[PDB]
Amino acid sequence: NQVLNDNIRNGHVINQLMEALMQLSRQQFPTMPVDYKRSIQRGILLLSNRLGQLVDLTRLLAYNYETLMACVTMNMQHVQTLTTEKLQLTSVTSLCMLIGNATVIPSPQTLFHYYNVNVNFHSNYNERINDAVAIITAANRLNLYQKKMKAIVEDFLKRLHIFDVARVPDDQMYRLRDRLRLLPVEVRRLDIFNLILMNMDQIERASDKIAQGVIIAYRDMQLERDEMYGYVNIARNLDGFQQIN
Amino acid sequence: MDVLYSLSKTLKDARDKIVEGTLYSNVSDLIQQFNQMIITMNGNEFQTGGIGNLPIRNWNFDFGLLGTTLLNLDANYVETARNTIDYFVDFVDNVCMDEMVRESQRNGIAPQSDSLRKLSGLKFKRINFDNSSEYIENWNLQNRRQRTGFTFHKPNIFPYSASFTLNRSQPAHDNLMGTMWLNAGSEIQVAGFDYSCAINAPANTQQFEHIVQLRRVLTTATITLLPDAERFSFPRVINSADGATTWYFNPVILRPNNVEVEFLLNGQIINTYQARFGTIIARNFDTIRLSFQLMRPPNMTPAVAALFPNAQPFEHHATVGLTLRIESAVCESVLADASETMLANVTSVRQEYAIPVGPVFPPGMNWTDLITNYSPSREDNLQRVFTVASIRSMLVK
Amino acid sequence: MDVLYSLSKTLKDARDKIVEGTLYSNVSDLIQQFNQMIITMNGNEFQTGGIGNLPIRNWNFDFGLLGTTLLNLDANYVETARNTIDYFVDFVDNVCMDEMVRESQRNGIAPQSDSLRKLSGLKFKRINFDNSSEYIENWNLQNRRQRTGFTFHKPNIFPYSASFTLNRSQPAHDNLMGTMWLNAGSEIQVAGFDYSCAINAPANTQQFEHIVQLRRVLTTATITLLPDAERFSFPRVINSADGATTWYFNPVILRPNNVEVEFLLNGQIINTYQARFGTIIARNFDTIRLSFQLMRPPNMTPAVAALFPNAQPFEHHATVGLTLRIESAVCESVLADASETMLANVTSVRQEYAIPVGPVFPPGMNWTDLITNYSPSREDNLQRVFTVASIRSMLVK
Amino acid sequence: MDVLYSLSKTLKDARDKIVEGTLYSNVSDLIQQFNQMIITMNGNEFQTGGIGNLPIRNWNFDFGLLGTTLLNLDANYVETARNTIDYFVDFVDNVCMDEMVRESQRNGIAPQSDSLRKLSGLKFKRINFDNSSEYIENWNLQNRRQRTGFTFHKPNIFPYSASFTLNRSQPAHDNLMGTMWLNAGSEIQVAGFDYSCAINAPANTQQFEHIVQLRRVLTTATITLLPDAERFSFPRVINSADGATTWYFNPVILRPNNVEVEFLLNGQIINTYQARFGTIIARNFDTIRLSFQLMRPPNMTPAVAALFPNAQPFEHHATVGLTLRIESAVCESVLADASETMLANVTSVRQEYAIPVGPVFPPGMNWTDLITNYSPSREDNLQRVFTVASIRSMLVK
Amino acid sequence: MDVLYSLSKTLKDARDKIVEGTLYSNVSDLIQQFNQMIITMNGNEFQTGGIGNLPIRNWNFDFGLLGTTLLNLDANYVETARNTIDYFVDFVDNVCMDEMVRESQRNGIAPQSDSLRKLSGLKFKRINFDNSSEYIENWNLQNRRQRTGFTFHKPNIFPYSASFTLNRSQPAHDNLMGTMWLNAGSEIQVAGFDYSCAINAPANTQQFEHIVQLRRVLTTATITLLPDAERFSFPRVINSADGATTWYFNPVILRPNNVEVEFLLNGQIINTYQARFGTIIARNFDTIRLSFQLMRPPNMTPAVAALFPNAQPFEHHATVGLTLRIESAVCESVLADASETMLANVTSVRQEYAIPVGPVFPPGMNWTDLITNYSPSREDNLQRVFTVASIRSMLVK
């Protein structure tokens, strides 16, 4: 579970807070107009007094994150998203000096629900993956040189819900294949294809309507006889004459 | 190190299971493993060689992967692969060789080369696999700690030693008594001679003894013990102990009497055999003691009586002997033997590249010198160096 | 039995292919097989020992499984596994050893121990896999029954035998004619001597012959045949046939004349070689017959003429000889040879644990005694016991 | 094994840091660790004993836990705890002792008892902690293969040896020349005597030498070297080499001339000191060589001249000597020394419970016998057994 | 400096308290401390070596941190850590050693190496902790200044001195009176001899005295004082004071009369003992004065009377002596003793790396030379160097 953690220090050992404050407790001095230090330090103190409480904040998050987190299957490497998420220091500031002996946590029922979801999702991702792979590989040893590209990919993403394809850079969808076409295959999936191929031939000729090619001899040739058809012209063996796929 | 191993069984189980035809299904579990490697690699740069007359080739990587497509290999697939393997082959060679020469007193049991010191790195471990090659199997078990073990045919445990000890001698060397022997490899031949044919000896019997101390314990040894020492059954002119003159040995052979072979371990008798010739088992020992006697024949036909007079000159010298050969055995330490090419590989690579004598191994990797003073440092270096030779022989012979 | 086998290639192909790194894929087909085992086991109590100095360790089974929820094996994965293997290792050892001693006349070809009698059980057969270990490969083929077979370097087919036969002798032993030999392991040396140098023999030629009957047929034998028997080329004082006195042998060697080696099978000549020294092939035989002659030199320089007078005393004894060594061969029955440790393993385990002499094997598993009277019971027990030793050596050396 | 360790520092850092008074916060990090244990245990059964006069006690588990409540510790809290510890104390004792007697040849190192074989189990590992006890610190590093290490005062490296060597002697023993010594523990005393006071010796100087080969290398040794061997400075009546008679030694002491001490490692001089008495450092050696001479005084007052006549009888025997003591040193192998109680603990537990002599250790754990033939098996067993003794001494002295 | 310390107890209390399985909580206070370090480091570069056969290795940093809210540590956690510690280990070694050879005079009491001069830097002080290692405990207190001190067994306060002083002598050396002694380490043996047995001495008593001035004050000394000097109780041939001839000493021992031992401090008697043999305490002294007398026996049996005639020749030389050993003591200055390996560590590292003689320490760190002229500079350098040796021994022995 790659779930980037953080200082036990931060955790509840909190002090960082106590130090964040002590460092503040000695910033009260000259340089420019008076309407300045006055206003400035006065604000600072409101952090100090509240510090007793600000402590509590650290604890809170510490736990919560440290809790919720647990129930996450979806690994999580740290990446530089392409989108932000605006955060007005406005609210920040409020939360800060504005919290008292409050104490809340995740309702049991709440937690599960969380697990459950990531779960499903995961399962879907993983599963479709297999569903995906299986197909593509088959797609190659079948010489179905055609769809292989998009076709499969499209369905794939759709079933994953989450994103609306379309706005997927073309470099992405294909690159997606490039990665997929390099994995094993749920024994289940795989184990079956191996089966179909082995019998494949047998089915095809074993059908009523349709047979494999014909031969030309321009040589008054002798018709054969077979119980099931009577007097007919078959020949289960083409050998001795070129073959033209 | 373990890293190194993989790099090979990778290629062998590769250059072997990949040919025009075969179904993909015989390599799915294989292909994968392979690729994984390529990735970890390319991007990192290497340097090999320098010391002695050994070229310094620099190596870069950035090779595309494979296909999981075709479920029936087409010739074209092979060639585009063999061309990528032949860079790893010609590589590894230059890699083995580089760490197959550097020695270190202090901690000369671990990696040395700028090539390998970088391999033991962590970001590489992502490869290790199929450790069924007798040698690696043993390298690991040694890292953790456990009853290791190897298998040898005609092992090379005895440093060459060919000498004699005169228990009774005089300036003229006309009435000697003593033993002469040859300890070499897996064989011992020892003869006890008494020019007087025990004429004045108590019970007309002269006792002999030959003790050989192994530098390493051998276990599960299958041994051939035969009476007589053919090597010391013919006339010889030998240098005296002080090198000042030469004496004459004119043997006549009698059966060794009261033969007793003891295989001891730390002074304790583990196996003892009384006059048993043929095949015997010595299960655990660090010392062999051969005791045998010359007993003057109590009854002699005229022709025999004539060889053994009551007074000097003693012209026919009564001799009894034994021959002992260790056909196979197990040793917890690496050793040279009559089948493995390890010693020869290491010695050969060093000789070919004019590698200077180092601080650990005797000049020329001389076996006798090595086994005579088989220090812990020499053994650790020898094992490292033998294990590398074995990794190399999986691809290059 | 076959059961037993798996238990190992299981662990080897395990303790070998499972290490910090590799991609799951390499072991998917492996992991599975493994688990399957654990299941079948857990819950069954096992007892080992109860004889001589053999501890009686009891074993319980309650072990977890192996998640398949990973790609690259993290160190943590290994250790939690090695700890579970080290119970099977230290187990199997105590298992092999237990059935590597008991013997049974009636059904010696079968299992004995309270440990194994329970293994042949049906509910366990759910394991068996990868039977490519030369020995098991042969165990199986022997129960359905067919052309079984093994490989041996310098095999051990000849029970030790060192003796002579005087075809012409007299009390003084001053004019003897006969042969002396040493048959041991894979080698035969035989010399024919005629004190009179065929002075009164028809065509001045004395015929000699040495026949050796193998206890088992050897096929595909590569053999070295050389003229002369070095072992019988030196002066000796030997005990008379009745042990009442000693005779003198003072050989002078001549080339063996009209050498003919026959490798016979059931009385039929399968291979015959006339005076061919060097490497020869004997493809299927149960008997070797060496015929050779001493022919008095028709022309002699003075020095030679002086050795062979028309009348006694005969002081230089004309001797001709042959040396034959079986380098390699195939046998349908297990045998000791110069490379395999089987005999030594079995003999060593029995010696270490002070196992009492049983009803089948000679005291000390003595090879000469065993091969001399190689009964069907001894062979079936030997094969069972050798196969177990080979299973054990896959893990413990 | 490592398991075992914890079980103790658990109790010590327990029976010690827990008393009527202190605040919870001083043990919060401790209490926790503790409980964790209890859990893992309860439900599991153990048995110990069954060898000699050693009882066979059976133990079961299902104990409560501990209040994470209270701010301060009230007496009542202690007692309800001590009562639960005293079962673990009286337990561990019976545990250590059980695995402190069983010895083995093959894997003489690993566990042995039905008590411990179950501890190395995986489900227990959840206990290990605070491994600063010098011995465990070293046990681990050894399982990983690293430059280990111990500390000893007056170490016990020399097996007891008290003897002499007469380089010149005659039946009357009235004009002897040779050396006599005592090697024992960490000390060596050696004297060289020459009854003739080098009257006919080249340069009127008699050379002496004493070589002592350690069974294990000692590093970082602080050594006291002093001239004279007080032990051999007084009149003695000694048995002759053959035990047939007694000789008289009447020493008069002279200063040892050209004293040279060499501390060698594998034949190489690592440290050499010429006539330096007092404190010297020998940093790494497996052999000590002491060379010293007796030089006839070139100038003698009448009283001195009278002791050394030109002709026999020689009534005052010129003697020179040296004394060497290893005060402290480091050894990579466990050894007995003058401060640690390990050897005494192991020897004492075995003696008290009438433990039968086993296959590894000499009768009575005799130190001289042990160090004389300090095989790998004896060392592995000794280390296991010494480490357990040290774990035990943390709680029971 | 203090910096350095931490770097270790960091690793020990690390490579020890961090094992497979331990509950988290008992390390929380630890993990933290650890990380803090890593940070401060990564970024800054270091230089090691550059003198003699001292390698010159370079170092860099950038290692991931450590987890926090876990529970029980999984094997995988360890290995990814041990690999990061083994760089600090192999580092510190190369660090200690570098500053364990450099010496300065003006200010040879402080840091020297390009490695350490950078450590005392301020941005580093962010680490110091757990200073319970006897040596650092004392380093600090010395920095701030105060009653420092250490603990020693058989301390090494007396430079080797073995000599004599003839208070009455003559050319023939047939009627001498004086003292001879051996001061070495923690022991003093002194004998007073009077060839005339005080025949013409006032009250038939000859007074003797031996004074030994310590180079440093010893406090809280436990001392063994015994009558007799065994070292000077046997016959000797000694060189004359001018080296021109040799005299004969033939002692006969009498009990020392009116024994008085004074332990003085700056000329003042701190402790005085009159004829008290056994264990005595000397609480603070820089000088020991031993006074004792030889009193001619007023009543003598014939055998005794015969040894002491009224006129020369005096053939039996009356001798009285004392032996004093300092078993333990405290000193405010570092000293070598019989248990600590500091001197040996420093001396050994310098010898192994062929470190050239410097301006402060005598060649070879010779103890006698060092303690004889124990200047302030030598003591400050010795303490720095001993403290570093002790820091090193916490990790590397």
List the helices and strands and how they pair.
This is part of a larger assembly, with 1 copy of chain A (245 residues) and 4 copies of chain B (397 residues).
Chain A: H1 8-11, H2 16-22, H3 34-68, H4 89-97, H5 108-140, H6 150-159, H7 170-180, H8 187-205, E1 224-226, E2 230-232
Antiparallel strand pairs in A: 1-2
Chain B: H1 2-15, H2 28-41, E1 46-50, E2 54-59, H3 75-99, H4 134-144, E3 150-153, E4 158-168, E5 177-185, E6 187-194, E7 205-227, E8 236-239, E9 246-249, E10 251-253, E11 257-265, E12 268-274, E13 278-295, H5 302-305, E14 317-331, H6 342-352, H7 367-372, H8 376-392
Parallel strand pairs in B: 10-14
Antiparallel strand pairs in B: 1-2, 3-14, 4-5, 5-6, 6-14, 7-13, 7-14, 8-9, 11-12, 11-13
Helix pairs in contact in B: 1-3, 3-8, 6-8
Task: Report on this structure.
The structure is cut from a larger assembly and holds one copy of chain A (245 residues) and four copies of chain B (397 residues). Chain A has 245 residues and is mostly helical. Chain A has helices at 8-11, 16-22, 34-68, 89-97, 108-140, 150-159, 170-180, 187-205, and strands at residues 224-226, 230-232. A two-stranded antiparallel ribbon of chain A has the order 1-2. In chain A, a hairpin with a 3-residue loop joins strand 1 (224-226) and strand 2 (230-232). In chain A, helix 2 runs antiparallel to helix 3 and helix 5 (108-140) runs antiparallel to helix 6 (150-159). The longest helix of chain A is centred in the N-terminal third of the chain and has 35 residues, at 34-68. Chain B is α+β, with helices and mostly antiparallel strands and 397 residues long. Chain B has two domains: 1-158 and 329-397, Viral capsid alpha domain; 159-328, Jelly Rolls (Sandwich), CATH 2.60.120. Chain B has eight helices and 14 strands. Chain B has helices at 2-15, 28-41, 75-99, 134-144, 302-305, 342-352, 367-372, 376-392, and strands at 46-50, 54-59, 150-153, 158-168, 177-185, 187-194, 205-227, 236-239, 246-249, 251-253, 257-265, 268-274, 278-295, 317-331. In chain B, the strands form three sheets. In chain B, strands 3, 4, 5, 6, 7, 10, 11, 12, 13 and 14 form a ten-stranded mixed β-sheet that branches. In chain B, a hairpin with a 2-residue loop joins strand 11 (257-265) and strand 12. Chains in contact: A-B, A-E, B-C, B-D, C-D, C-E, D-E. The interface between D and E is large, with 68 and 62 residues. Chains B, C, D, E: Homotrimer. Interacts with the inner capsid protein VP2. Interacts with the outer capsid glycoprotein VP7. Interacts with the outer capsid protein VP5*. Chains B, C, D, E: GO terms for molecular function: host cell surface receptor binding; metal ion binding; structural molecule activity. Chains B, C, D, E: This is Intermediate capsid protein VP6.
